[PDB]
Short mmCIF file of C-alpha atoms in Angstrom, two decimals:
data_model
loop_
_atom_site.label_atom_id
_atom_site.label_comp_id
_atom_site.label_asym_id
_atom_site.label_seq_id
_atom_site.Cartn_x
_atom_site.Cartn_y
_atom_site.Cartn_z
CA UNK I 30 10.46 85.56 42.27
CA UNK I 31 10.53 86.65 46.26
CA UNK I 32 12.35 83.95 48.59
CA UNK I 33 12.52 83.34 52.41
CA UNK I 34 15.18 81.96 54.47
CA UNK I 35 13.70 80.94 58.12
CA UNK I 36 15.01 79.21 61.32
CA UNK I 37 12.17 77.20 63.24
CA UNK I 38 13.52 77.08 66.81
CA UNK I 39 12.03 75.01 69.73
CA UNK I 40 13.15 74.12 73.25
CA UNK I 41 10.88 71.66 75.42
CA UNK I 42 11.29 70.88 78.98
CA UNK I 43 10.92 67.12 80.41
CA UNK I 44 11.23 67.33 84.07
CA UNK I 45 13.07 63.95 85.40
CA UNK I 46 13.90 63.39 81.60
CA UNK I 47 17.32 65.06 81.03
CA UNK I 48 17.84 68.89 79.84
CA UNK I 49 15.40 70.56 77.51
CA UNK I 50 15.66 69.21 73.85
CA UNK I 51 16.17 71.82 71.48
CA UNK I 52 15.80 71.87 67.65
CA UNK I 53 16.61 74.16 64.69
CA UNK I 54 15.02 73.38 61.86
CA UNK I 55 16.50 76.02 58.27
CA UNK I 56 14.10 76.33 55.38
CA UNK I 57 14.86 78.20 52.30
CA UNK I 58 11.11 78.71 50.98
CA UNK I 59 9.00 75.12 51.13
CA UNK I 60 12.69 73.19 51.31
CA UNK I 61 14.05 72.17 54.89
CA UNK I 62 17.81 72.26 54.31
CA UNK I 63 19.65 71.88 57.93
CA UNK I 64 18.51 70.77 61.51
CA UNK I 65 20.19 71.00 64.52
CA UNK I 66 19.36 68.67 67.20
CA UNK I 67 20.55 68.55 70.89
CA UNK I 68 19.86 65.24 71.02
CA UNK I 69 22.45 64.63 68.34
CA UNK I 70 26.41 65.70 67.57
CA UNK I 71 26.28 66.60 64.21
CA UNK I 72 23.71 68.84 62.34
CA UNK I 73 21.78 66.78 59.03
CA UNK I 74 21.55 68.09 55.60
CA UNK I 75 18.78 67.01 54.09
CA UNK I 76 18.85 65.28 50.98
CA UNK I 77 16.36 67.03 49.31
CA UNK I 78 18.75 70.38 49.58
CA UNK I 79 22.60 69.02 48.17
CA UNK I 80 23.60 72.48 47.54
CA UNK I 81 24.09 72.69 51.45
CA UNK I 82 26.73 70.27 50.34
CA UNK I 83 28.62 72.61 49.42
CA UNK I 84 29.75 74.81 52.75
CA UNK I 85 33.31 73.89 53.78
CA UNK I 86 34.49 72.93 57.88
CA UNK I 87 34.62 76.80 58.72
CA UNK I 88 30.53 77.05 58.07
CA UNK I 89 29.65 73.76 59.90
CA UNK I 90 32.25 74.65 62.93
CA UNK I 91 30.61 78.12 63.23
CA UNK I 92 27.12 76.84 62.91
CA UNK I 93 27.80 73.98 65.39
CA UNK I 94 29.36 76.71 68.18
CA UNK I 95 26.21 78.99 67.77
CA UNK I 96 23.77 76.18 67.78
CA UNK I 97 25.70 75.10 70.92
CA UNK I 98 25.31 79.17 72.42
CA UNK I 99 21.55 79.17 71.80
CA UNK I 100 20.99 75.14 73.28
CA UNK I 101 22.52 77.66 76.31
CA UNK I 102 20.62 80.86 76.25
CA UNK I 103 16.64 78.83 75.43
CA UNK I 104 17.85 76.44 78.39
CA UNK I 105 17.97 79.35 80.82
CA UNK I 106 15.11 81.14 79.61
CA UNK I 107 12.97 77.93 80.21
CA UNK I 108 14.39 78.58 83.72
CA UNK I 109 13.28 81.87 83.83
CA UNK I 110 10.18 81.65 81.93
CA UNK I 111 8.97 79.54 84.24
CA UNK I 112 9.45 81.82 87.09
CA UNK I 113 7.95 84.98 85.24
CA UNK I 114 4.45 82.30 84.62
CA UNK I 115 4.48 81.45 88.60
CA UNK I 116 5.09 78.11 87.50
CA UNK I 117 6.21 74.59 89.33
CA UNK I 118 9.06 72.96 88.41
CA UNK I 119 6.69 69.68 87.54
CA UNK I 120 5.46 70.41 84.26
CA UNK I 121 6.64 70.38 80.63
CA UNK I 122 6.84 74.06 78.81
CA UNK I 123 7.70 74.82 75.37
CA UNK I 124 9.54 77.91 74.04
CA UNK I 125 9.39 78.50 70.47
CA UNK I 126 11.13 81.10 68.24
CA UNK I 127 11.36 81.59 64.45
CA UNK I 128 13.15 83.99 62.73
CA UNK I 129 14.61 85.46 59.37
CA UNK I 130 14.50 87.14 56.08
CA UNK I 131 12.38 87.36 52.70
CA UNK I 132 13.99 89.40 49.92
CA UNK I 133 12.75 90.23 46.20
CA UNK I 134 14.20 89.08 42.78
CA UNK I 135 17.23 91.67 43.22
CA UNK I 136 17.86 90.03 46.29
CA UNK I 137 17.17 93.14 48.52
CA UNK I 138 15.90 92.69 51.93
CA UNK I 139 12.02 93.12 51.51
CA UNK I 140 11.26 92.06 55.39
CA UNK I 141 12.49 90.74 58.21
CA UNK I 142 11.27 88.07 61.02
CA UNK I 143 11.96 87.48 64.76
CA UNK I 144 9.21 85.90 66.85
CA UNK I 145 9.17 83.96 70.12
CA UNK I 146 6.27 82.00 71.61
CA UNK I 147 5.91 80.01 75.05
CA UNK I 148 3.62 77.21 75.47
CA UNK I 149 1.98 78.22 72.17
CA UNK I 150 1.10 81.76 72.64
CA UNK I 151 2.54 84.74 71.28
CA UNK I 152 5.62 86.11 73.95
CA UNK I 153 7.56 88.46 71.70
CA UNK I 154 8.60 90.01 68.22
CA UNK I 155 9.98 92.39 66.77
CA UNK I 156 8.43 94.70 64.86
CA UNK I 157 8.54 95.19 60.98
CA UNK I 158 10.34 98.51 61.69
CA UNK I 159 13.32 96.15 62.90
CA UNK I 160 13.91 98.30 65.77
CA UNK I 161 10.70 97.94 68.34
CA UNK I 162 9.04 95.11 70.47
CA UNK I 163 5.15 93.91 70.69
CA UNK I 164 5.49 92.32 74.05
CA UNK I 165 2.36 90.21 74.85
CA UNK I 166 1.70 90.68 78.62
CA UNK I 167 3.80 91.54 81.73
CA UNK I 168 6.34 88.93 81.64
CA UNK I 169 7.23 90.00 77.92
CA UNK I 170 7.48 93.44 79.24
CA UNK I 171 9.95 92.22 81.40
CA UNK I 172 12.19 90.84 78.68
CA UNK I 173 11.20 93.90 76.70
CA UNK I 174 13.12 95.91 79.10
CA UNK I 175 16.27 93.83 79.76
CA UNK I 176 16.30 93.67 75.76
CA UNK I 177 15.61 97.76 75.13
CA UNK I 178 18.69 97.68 77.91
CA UNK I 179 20.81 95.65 75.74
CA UNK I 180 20.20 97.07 72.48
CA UNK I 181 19.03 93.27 70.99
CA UNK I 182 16.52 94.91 68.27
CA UNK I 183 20.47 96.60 66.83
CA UNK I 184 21.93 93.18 67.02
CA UNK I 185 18.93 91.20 65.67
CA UNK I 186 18.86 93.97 62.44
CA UNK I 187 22.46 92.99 61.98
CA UNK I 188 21.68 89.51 61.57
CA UNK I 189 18.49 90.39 59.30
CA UNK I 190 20.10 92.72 57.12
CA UNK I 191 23.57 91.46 56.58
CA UNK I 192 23.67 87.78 57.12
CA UNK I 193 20.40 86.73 56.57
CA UNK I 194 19.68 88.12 53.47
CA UNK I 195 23.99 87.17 52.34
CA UNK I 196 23.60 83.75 52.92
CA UNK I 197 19.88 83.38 51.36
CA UNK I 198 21.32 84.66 48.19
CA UNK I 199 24.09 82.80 48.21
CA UNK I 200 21.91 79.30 49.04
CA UNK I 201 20.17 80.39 46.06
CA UNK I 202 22.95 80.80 44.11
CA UNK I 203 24.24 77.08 44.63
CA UNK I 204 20.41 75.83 44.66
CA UNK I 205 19.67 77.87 41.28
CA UNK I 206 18.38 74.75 39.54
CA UNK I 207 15.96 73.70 42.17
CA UNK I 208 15.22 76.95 44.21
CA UNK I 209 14.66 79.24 41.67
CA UNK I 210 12.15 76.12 39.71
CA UNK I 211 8.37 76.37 40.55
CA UNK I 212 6.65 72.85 39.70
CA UNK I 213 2.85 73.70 38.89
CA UNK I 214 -0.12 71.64 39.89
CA UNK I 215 -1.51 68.56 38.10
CA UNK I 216 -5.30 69.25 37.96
CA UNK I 217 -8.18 66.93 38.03
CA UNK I 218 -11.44 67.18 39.07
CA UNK I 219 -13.55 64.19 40.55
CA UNK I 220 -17.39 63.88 41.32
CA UNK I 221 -19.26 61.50 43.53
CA UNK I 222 -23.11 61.59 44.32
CA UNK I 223 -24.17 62.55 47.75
CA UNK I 224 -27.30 61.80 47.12
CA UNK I 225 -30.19 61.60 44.29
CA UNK I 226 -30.13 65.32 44.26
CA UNK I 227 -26.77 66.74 45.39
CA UNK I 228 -23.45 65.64 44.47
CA UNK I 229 -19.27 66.85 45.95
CA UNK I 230 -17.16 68.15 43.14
CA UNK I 231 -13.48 67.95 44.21
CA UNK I 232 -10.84 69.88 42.55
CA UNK I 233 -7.10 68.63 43.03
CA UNK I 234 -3.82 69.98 42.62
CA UNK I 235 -0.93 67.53 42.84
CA UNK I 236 3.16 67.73 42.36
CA UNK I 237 3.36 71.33 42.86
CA UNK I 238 5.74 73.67 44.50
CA UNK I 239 6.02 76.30 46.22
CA UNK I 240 3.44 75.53 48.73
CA UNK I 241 1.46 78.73 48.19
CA UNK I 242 -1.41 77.83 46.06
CA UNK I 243 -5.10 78.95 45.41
CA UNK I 244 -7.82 76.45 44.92
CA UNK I 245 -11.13 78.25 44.59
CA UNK I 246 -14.70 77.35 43.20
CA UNK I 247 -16.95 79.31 41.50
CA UNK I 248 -20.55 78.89 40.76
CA UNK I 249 -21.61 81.25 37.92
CA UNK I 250 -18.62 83.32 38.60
CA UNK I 251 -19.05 83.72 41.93
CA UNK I 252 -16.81 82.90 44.41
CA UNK I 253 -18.19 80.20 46.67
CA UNK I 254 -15.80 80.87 49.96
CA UNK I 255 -18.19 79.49 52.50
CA UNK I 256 -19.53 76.48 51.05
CA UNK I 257 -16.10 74.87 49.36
CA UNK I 258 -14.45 72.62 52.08
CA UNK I 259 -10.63 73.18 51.67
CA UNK I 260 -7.99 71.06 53.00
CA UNK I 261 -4.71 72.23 54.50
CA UNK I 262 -2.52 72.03 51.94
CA UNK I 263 -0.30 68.28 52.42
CA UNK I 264 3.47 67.62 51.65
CA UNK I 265 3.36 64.58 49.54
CA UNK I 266 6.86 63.85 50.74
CA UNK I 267 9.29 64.36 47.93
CA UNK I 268 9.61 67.95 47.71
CA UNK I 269 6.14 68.69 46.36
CA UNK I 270 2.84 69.51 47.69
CA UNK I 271 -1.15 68.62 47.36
CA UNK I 272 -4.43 70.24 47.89
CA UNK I 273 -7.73 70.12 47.02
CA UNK I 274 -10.84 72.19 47.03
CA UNK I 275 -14.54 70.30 47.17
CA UNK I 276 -18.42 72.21 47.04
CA UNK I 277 -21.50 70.01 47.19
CA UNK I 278 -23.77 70.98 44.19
CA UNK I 279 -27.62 69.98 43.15
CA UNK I 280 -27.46 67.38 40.41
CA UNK I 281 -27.62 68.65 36.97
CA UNK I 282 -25.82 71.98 37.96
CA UNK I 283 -22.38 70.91 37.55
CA UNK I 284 -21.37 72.48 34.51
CA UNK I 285 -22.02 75.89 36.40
CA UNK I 286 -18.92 75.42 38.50
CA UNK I 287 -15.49 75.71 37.34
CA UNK I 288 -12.40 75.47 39.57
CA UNK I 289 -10.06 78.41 39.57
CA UNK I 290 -6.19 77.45 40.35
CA UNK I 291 -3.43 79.59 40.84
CA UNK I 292 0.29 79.15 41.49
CA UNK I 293 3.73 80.15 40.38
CA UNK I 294 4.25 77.23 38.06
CA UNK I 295 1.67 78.32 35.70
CA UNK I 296 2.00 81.42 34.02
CA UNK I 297 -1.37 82.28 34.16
CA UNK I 298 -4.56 80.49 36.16
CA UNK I 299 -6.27 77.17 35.13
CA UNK I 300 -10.02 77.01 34.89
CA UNK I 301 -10.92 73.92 35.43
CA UNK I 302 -14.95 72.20 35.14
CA UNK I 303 -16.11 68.53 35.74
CA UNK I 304 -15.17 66.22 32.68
CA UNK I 305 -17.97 63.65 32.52
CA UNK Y 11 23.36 80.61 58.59
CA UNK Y 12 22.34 80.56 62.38
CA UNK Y 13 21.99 83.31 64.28
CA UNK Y 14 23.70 83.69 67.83
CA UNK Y 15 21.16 84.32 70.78
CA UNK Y 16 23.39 86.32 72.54
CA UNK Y 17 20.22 87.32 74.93
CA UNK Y 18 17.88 84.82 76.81
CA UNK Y 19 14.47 86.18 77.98
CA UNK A 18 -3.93 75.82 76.07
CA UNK A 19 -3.71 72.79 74.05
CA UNK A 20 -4.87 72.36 70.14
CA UNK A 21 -5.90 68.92 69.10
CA UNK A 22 -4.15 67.56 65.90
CA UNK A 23 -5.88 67.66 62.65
CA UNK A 24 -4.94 64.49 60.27
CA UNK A 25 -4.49 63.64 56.90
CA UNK A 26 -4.08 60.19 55.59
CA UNK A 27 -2.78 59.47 51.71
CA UNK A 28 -0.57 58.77 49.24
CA UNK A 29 2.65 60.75 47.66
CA UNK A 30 1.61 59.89 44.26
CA UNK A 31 -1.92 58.72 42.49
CA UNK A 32 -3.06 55.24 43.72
CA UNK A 33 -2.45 52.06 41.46
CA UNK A 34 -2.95 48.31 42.73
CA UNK A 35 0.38 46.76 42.29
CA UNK A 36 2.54 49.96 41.63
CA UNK A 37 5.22 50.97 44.61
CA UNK A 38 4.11 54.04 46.71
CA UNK A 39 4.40 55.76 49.77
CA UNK A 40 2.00 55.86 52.62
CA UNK A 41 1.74 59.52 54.47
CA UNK A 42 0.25 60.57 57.18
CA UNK A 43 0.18 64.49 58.24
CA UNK A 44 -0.20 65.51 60.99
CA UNK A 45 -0.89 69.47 61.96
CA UNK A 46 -1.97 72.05 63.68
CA UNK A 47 -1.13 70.58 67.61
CA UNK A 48 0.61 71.96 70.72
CA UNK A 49 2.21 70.40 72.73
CA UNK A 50 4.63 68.55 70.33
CA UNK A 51 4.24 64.86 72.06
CA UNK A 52 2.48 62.88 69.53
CA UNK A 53 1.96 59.41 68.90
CA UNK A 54 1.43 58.22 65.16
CA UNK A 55 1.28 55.36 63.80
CA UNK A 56 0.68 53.71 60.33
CA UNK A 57 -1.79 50.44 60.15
CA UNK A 58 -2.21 47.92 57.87
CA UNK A 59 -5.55 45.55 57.45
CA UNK A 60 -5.66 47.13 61.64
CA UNK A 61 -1.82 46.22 62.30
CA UNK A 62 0.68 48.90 63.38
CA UNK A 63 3.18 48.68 60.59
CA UNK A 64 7.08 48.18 62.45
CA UNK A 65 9.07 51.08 60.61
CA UNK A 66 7.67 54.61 59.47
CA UNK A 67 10.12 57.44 59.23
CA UNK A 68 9.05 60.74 59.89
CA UNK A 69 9.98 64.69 59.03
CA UNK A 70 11.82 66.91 61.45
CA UNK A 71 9.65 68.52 63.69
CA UNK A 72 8.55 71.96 62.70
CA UNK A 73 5.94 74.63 63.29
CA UNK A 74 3.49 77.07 61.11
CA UNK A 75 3.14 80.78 61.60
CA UNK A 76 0.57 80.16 64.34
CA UNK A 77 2.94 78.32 66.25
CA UNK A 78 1.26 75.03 65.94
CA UNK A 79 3.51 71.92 65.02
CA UNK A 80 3.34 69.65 62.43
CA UNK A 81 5.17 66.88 61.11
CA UNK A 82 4.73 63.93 58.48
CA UNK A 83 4.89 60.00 59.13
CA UNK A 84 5.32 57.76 55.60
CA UNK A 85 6.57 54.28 54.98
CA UNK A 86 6.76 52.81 51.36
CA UNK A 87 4.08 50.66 50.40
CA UNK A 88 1.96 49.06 47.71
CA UNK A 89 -1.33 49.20 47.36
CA UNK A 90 -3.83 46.26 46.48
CA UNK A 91 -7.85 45.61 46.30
CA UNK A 92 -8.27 43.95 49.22
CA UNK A 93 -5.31 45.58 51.90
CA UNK A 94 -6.78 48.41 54.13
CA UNK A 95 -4.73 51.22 55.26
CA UNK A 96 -5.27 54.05 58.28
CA UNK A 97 -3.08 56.03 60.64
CA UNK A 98 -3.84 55.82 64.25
CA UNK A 99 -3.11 59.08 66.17
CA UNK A 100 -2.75 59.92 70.01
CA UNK A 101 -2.05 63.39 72.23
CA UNK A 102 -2.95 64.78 74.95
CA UNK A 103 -6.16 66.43 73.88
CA UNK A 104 -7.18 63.08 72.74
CA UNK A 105 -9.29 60.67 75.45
CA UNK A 106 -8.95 57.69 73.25
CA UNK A 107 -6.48 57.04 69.67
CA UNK A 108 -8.07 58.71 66.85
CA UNK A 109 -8.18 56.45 63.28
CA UNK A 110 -8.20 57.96 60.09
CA UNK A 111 -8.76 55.51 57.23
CA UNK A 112 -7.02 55.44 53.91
CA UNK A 113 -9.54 56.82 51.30
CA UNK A 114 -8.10 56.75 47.45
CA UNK A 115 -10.14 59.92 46.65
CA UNK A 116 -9.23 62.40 50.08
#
């Protein structure tokens, strides 16, 4: 199927606590692979991804120096952020940025990502075209300008197009067996009495992976959107993911419901109903 | 692979 | 300005009394990033919990999850206790086998 490689970036400023810590956290779909911390030396490889494993010196050295260049860059723009918000030097801000590529089975580029965010709000990104800004208010337009100056949106394509999308399909490559393997859901559905007339029919979806799932119920064969409480969907902490769907529904109507899950693991979707 | 932020804001 | 955390208290795999498993707690959806989380047994903070690398969804917001490896039995109670800005007092969310 399609795959993502993304870089979840974010610098934090502690006034009277020491420079801004900044973190750099590398997915490759649903599996964290690398962080960078400047609170620590070394980057981690997480154990979950041992086809990282396999990059010699050269790649750690080089990722090491450009972590090192950015801890730089998102350290001054706090600086400067703060000036372009009218901002004391008292409180604590928060940049964000996350950025990279998702390409289709023939590993062609199918889009690319570059987004920044300060104290939780949209700042800047650039566009799907890969060559224009949507700056969010005046001091965006500001960095809009100094970027349109500099000819970033050229440099950022670079990135998007050539390395990106090279070393996504070549983390693939070593990660074949793991990557490239969707894990479907284990179903079940439970019911508990609300009351003497109503009672909550929950539909779960365990062990799966990729993340992207849909849990839906239907009553009838309709499509019950507003009245089925959904949870955010959970990791269950090794590698896999959990969800469930639940709908309150008058006693004796239960067998008018069925739960409709999809997900890459199955090859096509599971219908499931309450077992009594 | 990171990518350098040559530009700040 | 600030989003208030949503949380999600449970277990990596289905519960059995006796049988080793691991406790999580999720956290989501919050900004700032400062959060305070811990993991409580029979009301007790429990010592050691390790925890996921801070991250972020589309929308910005950060998330992250606490676990510790645990065994369940009839009578020991579980919750996660959870604290941040937008929060007057700690919020506890209880263990419940079927959420």
């Amino acid at each position: 199927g399609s795959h993502s490689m993304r870089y979840f970036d974010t610098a934090m400023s502690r006034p009277g606590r020491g420079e801004p810590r900044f973190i750099s956290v590398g997915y490759v779909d649903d599996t964290q692979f690398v962080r960078f911390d400047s609170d620590a030396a070394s980057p981690r490889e997480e154990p979950r991804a041992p086809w990282i494993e396999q990059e010699g010196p050269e790649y750690w050295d080089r990722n090491t120096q450009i972590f090192k260049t950015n801890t730089q860059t998102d350290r001054e723009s706090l600086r400067i952020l703060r000036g372009y918000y009218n901002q004391s030097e008292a409180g604590s801000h928060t940049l964000q940025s996350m950025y990279g590529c998702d390409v289709g089975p023939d590993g062609r580029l199918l889009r690319g990502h570059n987004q920044y965010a300060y104290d939780g709000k949209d700042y800047i990104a650039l566009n799907e075209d890969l060559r224009s800004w949507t700056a969010a208010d005046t001091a965006a337009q500001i960095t809009q300008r100094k970027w349109e100056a500099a000819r970033v949106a050229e440099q950022d394509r670079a990135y998007l197009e050539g390395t990106c999308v090279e070393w996504l399909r070549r983390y693939l490559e070593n990660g074949k067996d793991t990557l490239e393997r969707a894990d479907p859901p284990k179903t079940h559905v439970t019911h508990h009495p609300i009351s003497d007339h109503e009672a909550t029919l929950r539909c779960w979806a365990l062990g799966f992976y990729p993340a992207e799932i849909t849990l839906t119920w239907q009553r009838d064969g309709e499509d019950q959107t507003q009245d089925t409480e959904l949870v955010e969907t959970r990791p269950a902490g090794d590698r896999t993911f959990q969800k469930w769907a639940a709908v309150v529904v008058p006693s004796g109507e239960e067998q008018r419901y069925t739960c409709h899950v999809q997900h890459e693991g199955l090859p096509k979707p599971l219908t499931l109903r309450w077992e009594p | 692979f990171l990518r350098g932020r040559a530009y700040g804001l | 300005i600030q989003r208030t955390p949503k949380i999600q208290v449970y277990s990596r795999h289905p519960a059995e009394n006796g049988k080793s498993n691991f406790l999580n707690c999720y956290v989501s959806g919050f900004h700032p990033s400062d959060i305070e989380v811990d993991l409580l047994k029979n009301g007790e903070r429990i010592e050691k919990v390790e925890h996921s690398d801070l991250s972020f969804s589309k929308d910005w917001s950060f998330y992250l999850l606490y676990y510790t490896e645990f065994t369940p039995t009839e009578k020991d109670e579980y919750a996660c206790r959870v604290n941040h800005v937008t929060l007057s007092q700690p919020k506890i969310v209880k263990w419940d086998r079927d959420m």
